[PDB]
Amino acid sequence: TVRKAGALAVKNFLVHKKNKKVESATRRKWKHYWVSLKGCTLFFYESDGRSGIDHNSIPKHAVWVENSIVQAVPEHPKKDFVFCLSNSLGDAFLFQTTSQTELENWITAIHSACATAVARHHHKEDTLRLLKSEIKKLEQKIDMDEKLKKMGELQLSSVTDSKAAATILDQIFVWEQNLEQFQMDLFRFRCYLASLQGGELPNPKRLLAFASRPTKVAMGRLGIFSVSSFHALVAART
Ligand SMILES: [Ca+2]
Ligand SMILES: [Ca+2]
Question: Is the same domain home to 129 and 199?
C-alpha cells in the first residue's frame, strides 16, 4: 500500500546520459507534488486544486528507488530541510520538507523500502540479518582488493617487462574502481541497516575520501562534491 506520503517541493538534480555519463540538471525552479512511496517507487501527483489525492488518482510520473541512497543536505545554500535521493541509475533528485523530524522520516521510509527490496531479491525473511551479512561480504571483498592493489603497487617497480608492468598498472586502476564500488555499496547497506535500527547514518566525509582522482575530476565537472554525486557517478557505471 502506501508506506509514506506527503507534500514535497521537488527538483531534478543529476541526470544519467548515454555512455555512462552523469550531468547536472538544467537550472530550474522547484515544483510541488504529493509524493507517495509504494513498494520501491515514488509516485508524483499534482493537485487539481479541489479534490484530494487517493488510490484512484493518476500519477504524473514515477521514480524507481530500489538500491538508492538518501542524504540530508543541511548545507544547501538557500533552503532548509532539503534531502537528496540518488538512484541506482545515476540520477538524483532534491526534495524539501517542513522540518528536521519529517526529513528524517522520509529518509527512514525510503531506506526501509530499499532494505525490503534487497531482502526480496535474496528470499530472506530476516531483513536485518541479511543486511549485516551483505555488509560482512563487502568488507571481505574490500580487504581482498586492498591487499591485491597493495601487492600490485609494490610489484610495479620490480617487473622489468614493459607489457607486464602495463598490465599491473591496469589492474591497480581496476582495483581502485572496484573499491569505490564496494565502499559505496557498504555505505548504502549501512544506511539501510541504520534506518531499520533507528541508529545514526554512516559518516559521509569518510565515504568521500574513497573517491579516486578521476571521480573527483568528474564531481568537479558536475559542480558538486557530495555522497549524492559520488553515488550517481558510481551507479552510472552499471
Ligand atoms: Ca522478517
Ligand atoms: Ca570493476
Answer: yes
